[PDB]
Amino acid sequence: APPAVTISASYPGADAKTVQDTVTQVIEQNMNGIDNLMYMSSNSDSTGTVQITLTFESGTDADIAQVQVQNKLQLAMPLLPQEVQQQGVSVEKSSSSFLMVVGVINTDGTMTQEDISDYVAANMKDAISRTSGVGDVQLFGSQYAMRIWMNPNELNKFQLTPVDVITAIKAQNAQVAAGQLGGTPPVKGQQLNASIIAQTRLTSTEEFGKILLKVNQDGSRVLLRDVAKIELGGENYDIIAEFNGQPASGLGIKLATGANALDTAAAIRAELAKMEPFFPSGLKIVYPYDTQGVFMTMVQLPAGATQERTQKVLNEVTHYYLTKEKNNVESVFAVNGFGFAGRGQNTGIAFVSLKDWADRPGEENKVEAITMRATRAFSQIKDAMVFAFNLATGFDFELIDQAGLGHEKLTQARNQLLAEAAKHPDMLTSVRPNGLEDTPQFKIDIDQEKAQALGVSINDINTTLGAAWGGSYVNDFIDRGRVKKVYVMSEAKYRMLPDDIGDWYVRAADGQMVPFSAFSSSRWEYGSPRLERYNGLPSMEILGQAAPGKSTGEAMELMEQLASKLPTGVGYDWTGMSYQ
Amino acid sequence: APPAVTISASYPGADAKTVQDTVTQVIEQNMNGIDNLMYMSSNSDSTGTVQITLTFESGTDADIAQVQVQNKLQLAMPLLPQEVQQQGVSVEKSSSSFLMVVGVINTDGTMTQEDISDYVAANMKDAISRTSGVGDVQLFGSQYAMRIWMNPNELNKFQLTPVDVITAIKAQNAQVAAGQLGGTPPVKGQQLNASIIAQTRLTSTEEFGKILLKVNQDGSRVLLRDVAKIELGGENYDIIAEFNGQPASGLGIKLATGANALDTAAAIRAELAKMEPFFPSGLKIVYPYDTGVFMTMVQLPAGATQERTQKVLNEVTHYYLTKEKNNVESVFAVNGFGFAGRGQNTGIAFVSLKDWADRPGEENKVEAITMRATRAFSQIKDAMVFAFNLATGFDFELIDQAGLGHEKLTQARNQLLAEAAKHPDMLTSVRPNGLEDTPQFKIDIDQEKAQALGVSINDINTTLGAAWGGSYVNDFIDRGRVKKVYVMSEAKYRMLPDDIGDWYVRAADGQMVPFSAFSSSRWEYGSPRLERYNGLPSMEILGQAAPGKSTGEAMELMEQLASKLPTGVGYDWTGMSY
Amino acid sequence: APPAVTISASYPGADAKTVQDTVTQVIEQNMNGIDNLMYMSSNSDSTGTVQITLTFESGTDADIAQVQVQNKLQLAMPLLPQEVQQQGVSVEKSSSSFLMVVGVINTDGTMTQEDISDYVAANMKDAISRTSGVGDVQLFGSQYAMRIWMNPNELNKFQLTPVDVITAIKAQNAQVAAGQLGGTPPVKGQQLNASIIAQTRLTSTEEFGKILLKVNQDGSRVLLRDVAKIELGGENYDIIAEFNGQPASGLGIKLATGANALDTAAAIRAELAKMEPFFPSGLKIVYPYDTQGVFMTMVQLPAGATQERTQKVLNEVTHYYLTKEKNNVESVFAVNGFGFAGRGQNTGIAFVSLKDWADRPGEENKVEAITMRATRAFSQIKDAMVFAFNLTGFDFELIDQAGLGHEKLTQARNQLLAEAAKHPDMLTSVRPNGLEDTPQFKIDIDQEKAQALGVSINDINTTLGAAWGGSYVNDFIDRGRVKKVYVMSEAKYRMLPDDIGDWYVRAADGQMVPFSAFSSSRWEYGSPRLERYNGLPSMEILGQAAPGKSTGEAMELMEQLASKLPTGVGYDWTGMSY
Amino acid sequence: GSDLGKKLLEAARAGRDDEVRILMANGADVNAADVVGWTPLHLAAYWGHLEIVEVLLKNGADVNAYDTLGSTPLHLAAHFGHLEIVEVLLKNGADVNAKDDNGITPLHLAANRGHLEIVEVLLKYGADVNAQDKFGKTAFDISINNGNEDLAEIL
Numbered sequence A: 001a002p003p004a005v006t007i008s009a010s011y012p013g014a015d016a017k018t019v020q021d022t023v024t025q026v027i028e029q030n031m032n033g034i035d036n037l038m039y040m041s042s043n044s045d046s047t048g049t050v051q052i053t054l055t056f057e058s059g060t061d062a063d064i065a066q067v068q069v070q071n072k073l074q075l076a077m078p079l080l081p082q083e084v085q086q087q088g089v090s091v092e093k094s095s096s097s098f099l100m101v102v103g104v105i106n107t108d109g110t111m112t113q114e115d116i117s118d119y120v121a122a123n124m125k126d127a128i129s130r131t132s133g134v135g136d137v138q139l140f141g142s143q144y145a146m147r148i149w150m151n152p153n154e155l156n157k158f159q160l161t162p163v164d165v166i167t168a169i170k171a172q173n174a175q176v177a178a179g180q181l182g183g184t185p186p187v188k189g190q191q192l193n194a195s196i197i198a199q200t201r202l203t204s205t206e207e208f209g210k211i212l213l214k215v216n217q218d219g220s221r222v223l224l225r226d227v228a229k230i231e232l233g234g235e236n237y238d239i240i241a242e243f244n245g246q247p248a249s250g251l252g253i254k255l256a257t258g259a260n261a262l263d264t265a266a267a268i269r270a271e272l273a274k275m276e277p278f279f280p281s282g283l284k285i286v287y288p289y290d291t292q293g294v295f296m297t298m299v300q301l302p303a304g305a306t307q308e309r310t311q312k313v314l315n316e317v318t319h320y321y322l323t324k325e326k327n328n329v330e331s332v333f334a335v336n337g338f339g340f341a342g343r344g345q346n347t348g349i350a351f352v353s354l355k356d357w358a359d360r361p362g363e364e365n366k367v368e369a370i371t372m373r374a375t376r377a378f379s380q381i382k383d384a385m386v387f388a389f390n391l392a393t394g395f396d397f398e399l400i401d402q403a404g405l406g407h408e409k410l411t412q413a414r415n416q417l418l419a420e421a422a423k424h425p426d427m428l429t430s431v432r433p434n435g436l437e438d439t440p441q442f443k444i445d446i447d448q449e450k451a452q453a454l455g456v457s458i459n460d461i462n463t464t465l466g467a468a469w470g471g472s473y474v475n476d477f478i479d480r481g482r483v484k485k486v487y488v489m490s491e492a493k494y495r496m497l498p499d500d501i502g503d504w505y506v507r508a509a510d511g512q513m514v515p516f517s518a519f520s521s522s523r524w525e526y527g528s529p530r531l532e533r534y535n536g537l538p539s540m541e542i543l544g545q546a547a548p549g550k551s552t553g554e555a556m557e558l559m560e561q562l563a564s565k566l567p568t569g570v571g572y573d574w575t576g577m578s579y580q
Numbered sequence B: 001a002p003p004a005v006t007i008s009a010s011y012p013g014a015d016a017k018t019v020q021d022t023v024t025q026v027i028e029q030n031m032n033g034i035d036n037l038m039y040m041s042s043n044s045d046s047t048g049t050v051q052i053t054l055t056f057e058s059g060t061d062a063d064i065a066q067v068q069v070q071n072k073l074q075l076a077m078p079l080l081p082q083e084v085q086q087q088g089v090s091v092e093k094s095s096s097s098f099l100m101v102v103g104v105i106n107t108d109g110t111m112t113q114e115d116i117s118d119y120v121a122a123n124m125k126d127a128i129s130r131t132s133g134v135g136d137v138q139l140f141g142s143q144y145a146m147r148i149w150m151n152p153n154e155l156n157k158f159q160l161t162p163v164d165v166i167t168a169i170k171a172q173n174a175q176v177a178a179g180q181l182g183g184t185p186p187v188k189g190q191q192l193n194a195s196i197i198a199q200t201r202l203t204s205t206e207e208f209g210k211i212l213l214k215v216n217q218d219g220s221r222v223l224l225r226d227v228a229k230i231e232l233g234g235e236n237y238d239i240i241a242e243f244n245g246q247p248a249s250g251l252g253i254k255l256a257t258g259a260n261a262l263d264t265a266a267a268i269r270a271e272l273a274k275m276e277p278f279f280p281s282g283l284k285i286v287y288p289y290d291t292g293v294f295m296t297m298v299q300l301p302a303g304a305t306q307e308r309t310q311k312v313l314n315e316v317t318h319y320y321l322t323k324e325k326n327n328v329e330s331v332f333a334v335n336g337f338g339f340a341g342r343g344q345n346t347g348i349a350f351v352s353l354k355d356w357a358d359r360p361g362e363e364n365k366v367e368a369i370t371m372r373a374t375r376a377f378s379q380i381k382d383a384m385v386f387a388f389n390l391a392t393g394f395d396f397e398l399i400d401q402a403g404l405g406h407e408k409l410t411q412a413r414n415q416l417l418a419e420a421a422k423h424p425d426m427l428t429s430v431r432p433n434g435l436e437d438t439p440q441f442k443i444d445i446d447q448e449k450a451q452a453l454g455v456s457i458n459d460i461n462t463t464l465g466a467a468w469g470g471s472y473v474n475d476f477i478d479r480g481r482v483k484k485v486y487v488m489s490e491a492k493y494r495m496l497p498d499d500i501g502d503w504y505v506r507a508a509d510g511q512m513v514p515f516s517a518f519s520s521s522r523w524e525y526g527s528p529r530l531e532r533y534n535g536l537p538s539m540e541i542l543g544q545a546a547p548g549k550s551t552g553e554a555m556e557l558m559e560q561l562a563s564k565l566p567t568g569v570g571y572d573w574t575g576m577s578y
Numbered sequence C: 001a002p003p004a005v006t007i008s009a010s011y012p013g014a015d016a017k018t019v020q021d022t023v024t025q026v027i028e029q030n031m032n033g034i035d036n037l038m039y040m041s042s043n044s045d046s047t048g049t050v051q052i053t054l055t056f057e058s059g060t061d062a063d064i065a066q067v068q069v070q071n072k073l074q075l076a077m078p079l080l081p082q083e084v085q086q087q088g089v090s091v092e093k094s095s096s097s098f099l100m101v102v103g104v105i106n107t108d109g110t111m112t113q114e115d116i117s118d119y120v121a122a123n124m125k126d127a128i129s130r131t132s133g134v135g136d137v138q139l140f141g142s143q144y145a146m147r148i149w150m151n152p153n154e155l156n157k158f159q160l161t162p163v164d165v166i167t168a169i170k171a172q173n174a175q176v177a178a179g180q181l182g183g184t185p186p187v188k189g190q191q192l193n194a195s196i197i198a199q200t201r202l203t204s205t206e207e208f209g210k211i212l213l214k215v216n217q218d219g220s221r222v223l224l225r226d227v228a229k230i231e232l233g234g235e236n237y238d239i240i241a242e243f244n245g246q247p248a249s250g251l252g253i254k255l256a257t258g259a260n261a262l263d264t265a266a267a268i269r270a271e272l273a274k275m276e277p278f279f280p281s282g283l284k285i286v287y288p289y290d291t292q293g294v295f296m297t298m299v300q301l302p303a304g305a306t307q308e309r310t311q312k313v314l315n316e317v318t319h320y321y322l323t324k325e326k327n328n329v330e331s332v333f334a335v336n337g338f339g340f341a342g343r344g345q346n347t348g349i350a351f352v353s354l355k356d357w358a359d360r361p362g363e364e365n366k367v368e369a370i371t372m373r374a375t376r377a378f379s380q381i382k383d384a385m386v387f388a389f390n391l392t393g394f395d396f397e398l399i400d401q402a403g404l405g406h407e408k409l410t411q412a413r414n415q416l417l418a419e420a421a422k423h424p425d426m427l428t429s430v431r432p433n434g435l436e437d438t439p440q441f442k443i444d445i446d447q448e449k450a451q452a453l454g455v456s457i458n459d460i461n462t463t464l465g466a467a468w469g470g471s472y473v474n475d476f477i478d479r480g481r482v483k484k485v486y487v488m489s490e491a492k493y494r495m496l497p498d499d500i501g502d503w504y505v506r507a508a509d510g511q512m513v514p515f516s517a518f519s520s521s522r523w524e525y526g527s528p529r530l531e532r533y534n535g536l537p538s539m540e541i542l543g544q545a546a547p548g549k550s551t552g553e554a555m556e557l558m559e560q561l562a563s564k565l566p567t568g569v570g571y572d573w574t575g576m577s578y
Numbered sequence D: 001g002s003d004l005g006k007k008l009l010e011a012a013r014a015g016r017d018d019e020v021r022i023l024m025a026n027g028a029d030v031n032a033a034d035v036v037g038w039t040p041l042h043l044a045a046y047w048g049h050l051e052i053v054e055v056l057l058k059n060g061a062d063v064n065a066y067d068t069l070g071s072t073p074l075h076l077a078a079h080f081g082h083l084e085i086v087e088v089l090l091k092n093g094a095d096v097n098a099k100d101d102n103g104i105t106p107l108h109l110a111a112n113r114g115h116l117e118i119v120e121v122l123l124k125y126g127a128d129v130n131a132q133d134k135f136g137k138t139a140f141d142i143s144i145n146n147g148n149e150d151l152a153e154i155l
């Protein structure tokens, strides 16, 4: 595996195109003048995530690659949205696969999945992330934040917006540098010296609840708990895990490039041994995947698939292992919302651990035959790519927009190539896109003339929409001595349907409350939930196989001939296993 | 050659003192804790550019040096003006030379240098960067920017200023996160999940033209196209380059460390061959330099303009292409660039000779060509024009050690140069490496009048800066690729002092106030290029020993002369003389 | 030695908890993916400073360690308060002990301690800091800033606040990029090109004094000098030095990890020799501590001690060496406000330089016997740990593993220390390495009353912090060098609790509101120095094996005692005990 | 007219006294002006070259030549504290109350930089102490604003 550096960033509430055009492109335009670079690829997703992977020639010093990529990233940093910079951009030098998973459960049932995930994020992850040889750590869940879940009816009733909520939280959840009595230089002869302590960060839902939003003309008070439900809850709600069907969280650990696997695994266990004696009651570490005794199952649904549907398919897979394979399988740690494709609502993964070598006699109880049978049983699941494998001869093709054609034309060109490839089962098998299809999206046009006539500012319009429907990271607070985030977002029931758009009011310069419907219009359209790029140009990755006993070479040759017939401005390249 | 690392930064519309005092000094003060540093030198100029060069001991690993410099620079970033941070502050190994300079020309008269540079940026540069053996690739030009060229008469007519234009572009050329319908955590049983797509970045001059500035009381709309001309153009207009008189862009290509020169040159030429079928009409690749090129320097007087320099460069080009038609393959004329300084009154012609084989006789070799060229060019009046090819010299720094300031350091340097001129038996051609002070337009904003009128000083300074210097507002998407948006006055409203009073600012009460109401101006002298050496103000002095004297004795004299300069002036030897 | 990388940052006017919760925890959470890191520790102090020490495995390359730290910190910079980012964060790879001290005095007594410190900061420190081998340089004093010392009676008289002062300084001490006459792209036929010079940084107290704050009803002017005293003075006033009793400043120099001590020291001397010829008259370099020959004396008073009492202890130490040991001691360089454990009002250090070895005959006149006599002589100074030493028992960290909080952790520490004291046969001098809680003035702003009166929370918090803590506004140019501008209350208005009530804030309706109308206050205890270890709240505990016991036995007992502490309190061994 | 005009402008700027005497001898226009309207006399007055000033005046240099913003050699001498030059200009007929385009007079400029002897000489030669610039300000207002009490005495 040639070494890879990955750049990761996050823009909460952002669609794939917004991520691509305000983050990914800005970074990629600086990714040149880096030594021993073979290629770069990126994904920009409607989870508001970007990942850029830079792949280096074998034998490259990974420290030096990481340094040189970060150097170029710093050119782009001041041009990125503040919302992205504040989430913390990461630059990692890791293997792309997991060395182990550390699962955490509560055998007293006294902690939910969400509680466990916060415990792991708040008391365990950081120490593991600093352990030498740990390249990347994935939390299977989310740290708590303070969640302010706004009610638009209540806000409108008091002539308040989400801008007023955000402003108040920044003003009343504050950590103030206030100086000293008697500080230097003093009046000579001064004896008293003391720090002044003024506002300090809030620590509890109770304090957030009594933030004072306004004082009415009659003297009554509107507090934040009068317009919002206040609770601790995940920074996000996209990743949920289970261990043998019970609530769990965990850490997926990847090895740093070139680091020693035995040693690093051992350092991880020694760090976990320091934490264990301080766990709350019931909390227990489990070891669902140590790299053979193990394998994984990938679940990939179509784009558009809800969390509930992915869960339904994960339930089938876990059901199969816990019923059909219960003599071979020790455990299943299943994760909805994260998979081999990274983070996404239509994706999951199951980590499967087998019983002892000794307790599984016969070929038919070894990992190959178990995974073969599993894949076969899951081959009939409708509208889902589910397969089981432990851990060569395909090809890995990039179709590239080389003329500013745009996503829609690139899709047409891809479909043309895929249909042509389908007419050669003698040379090519299962030629298919690696990516996701376009899905319906809700296009909203803000009318500038109406906004200006009414005296509603564009910034207020955008903050109201983005904060309500996407969530806004406001500032930090201190939860049980740890710095954590504060997020404002609509309560779920006010951001589910198109007609809810009109229940949100913005305050004009003259004090009148104006509904979103007065200055906006909307329509359904299609767009991409995952935009791909290859060496900085829009691209679409196509996987496939040489047919039985044709060389990869002949297979690649035909793809190139078929590609030579595509519309002008569409080119191609080979990557990964096909690059040499 | 000792390894060297260069820091480059840009402050659009800034003068040399502004750049020095908000960027150069701040970076310099943060260049500590770096290993193996021999010396540091900088220049800050009237094009708003700074270059700080750190020279390391021989044998220093240049990669280690580059990363240590870069890390200290990056920790100083929040100390720099936003406008500088937004241009990118680059830190590169600078002691490596070019493997090749590739020219990209258009021969059929259909493309400007900006058009060609955009084509190169979007379609060629990155393929060349990925070419086996290539290290750094520099584009000589930029990708397009969206240029909004403002008209102050139209702005005033609608009671608008550049501040309103900038605000409107940030509001209406925007792309922000708008969340999802049915997103997590959802009401359980939700079936619809869809991204919300709100405003998207503008993609064309037409879309910029329709930005709504305001609606009048009688219901008429003022659009950005009603107060500005709108076009794709360059990010910067300081340099104009021509190849045998035709517009041209270029790529400067360096060899990656450890790669083979010959194989890398051939790989570049093979990659450019494969691109050729896709070029638009009249685009051609030329190769002026590739591992017999010589240079012709052009220097016009103080305050001379680009068009005046262009006229001289055109005479230099015409000379080579007629009088040296048997020896000269090409003249790459670069107006605005000069090695001794950037600016409108300087240029260089890079002259590429035909193959040695086709130039028999001593009269057709570089020495004889350059002597003939210099003799023909000594006719030219209102420019110094010198042809030359590339150790008796010395490289001396005069240093302000006690806070004396520019005007005193210059008087000290003048004392030293007069004294060195009194010893023609020991010293020849003792001169400044840098530039002389030139006239500047000093404008003083009257704070009392501004406050009495209710005119904000930020509106004043943004109006002046945006109009006359230009401002990078935000980014747009051109044919799928992210690029910059700049606002600036249309050229004809920012040329001369009388144009200042055509700019109006809007007071808190809504009245339009002309600049003449709250400002006054005068001519004064100041520097177009400020120099520093090891963190202190400096002036570099070049010179050579007289015939039949060694540099040793000539240096010794310079030290004796330097020892009689005013209190607080020191010196140091640098470069070849280190 | 395991190599250590240190991160230092500052937040003017912040208390320990503010520093810890907005800076220290943020950086620590982002110190991931760094190779070979053994442990991390931090202190967050009431001086507004943080120091985070990352210690790497033996044999780690300290260059790579430093680079990895710098890069992770760079990515965490946007998460820190702007006030911190704008001070500069530093990251150093150096030994924790001094290699040498460069002292500076004025032999003609014509420059004060404050003047000398500015001279060193402005003319000497940066060149030393760039010298190869120099890992860290501590100035024993402070560089000048332009100090705007605000008077709340005059601000209130003119219906102004520190917010108005800050806004005016930003507007009127500004460096403006204003473009050019005849700038590119130009019109055809343009003859003139010249820089436009608009506002420039102020350079003198006189210029700051005339900043125009407002124009009254009748047209009388309110100048900054009408509400403030304007003077050059230190960016801070925390560190004051003396050399043999006379005003001094200097540089404390720490050797970069892996550099050569003799080579570095000689490079420093060569750099000082370039500066000396340009010193103002009277200034002179002394050498009070070159690493036999030398030793140090630590002075550590309890938290809460004033600059004045620390000074009184240092005067006793200095007096002892210059009278009782005058036959053995050549010099004493004493620093009030900096100590073995860095910066604080309650700490000092004295560097002692002995006369030639040959002129100190007798075992009784060698460093060992001298330090032992001095330590004995200083062992009866009241409420101060004072000892003489040259640059091993155990090093224990008590750790908050469960969100317990400072108060509970202090209780657990005290339980452990009480238990340790009951085993004087196994453990001796089991003590905290840090500082005890002290009284602090807790002020609550009443959000209801503020809203009722129309007073902004931002105006209140700026007013309080700028007046009582100081605020870095922007930069100015002092004798050609960029330096800082600070606004703060003049001393007499920020000394006592009743002074809080003389500060007025302007409400939205224009009325002036005193602080007393919307606030209340009380005394409470809190920490002047919060410690963390591997990212968790911690308290360091030192001690040793009792006479005739091994270190292992004493450690084993410490662990046994630690196993009986309240739930959620853990421990770890560090430093010499790791 | 002259190529020699341009050389005289440069020689005067850069202080070269011999070169000025020579170019004058060979016919250079003493009132040659550069693009900002500065004559050799302006340049010699700004850069403080007294003997060049005297030499130009004796060869007919126009003592009240004004640049493109209305400023005269006396403005420049007074602003930059060149006392001996101020006296020579005034001795040779300089308009002591010349106003530039902003209504600024040599006394305003001397007063602003605290050049007290120059203020005194200007006043001897009949400088209107109450002359106001475009903002209504006098030399006295300038002294008050700058907090220069010695200057405020004299006015």
Ligand SMILES: CC(=O)Nc1ccc(CCSc2nc(N3C[C@@H](C)O[C@@H](C)C3)c3c(c2C#N)CC(C)(C)OC3)cc1
Residues within 6 Å of the ligand: B098, B101, B140, B141, B142, B239, B240, B241, B248, B249, B250, B251, B252, B288, B289, B293, B332, B334, B337, B350, B351, B352
């Ligand atoms: C807008 C713009 O910058 N246009 C532009 C500028 C320069 C060029 C290339 C001119 S050809 C050339 N340029 C050089 N440079 C070097 C660079 C650092 O600076 C630029 C402006 C041009 C150098 C060489 C040639 C040739 N042949 C030869 C050599 C390597 C010896 O010296 C540098 C093309 C377009």
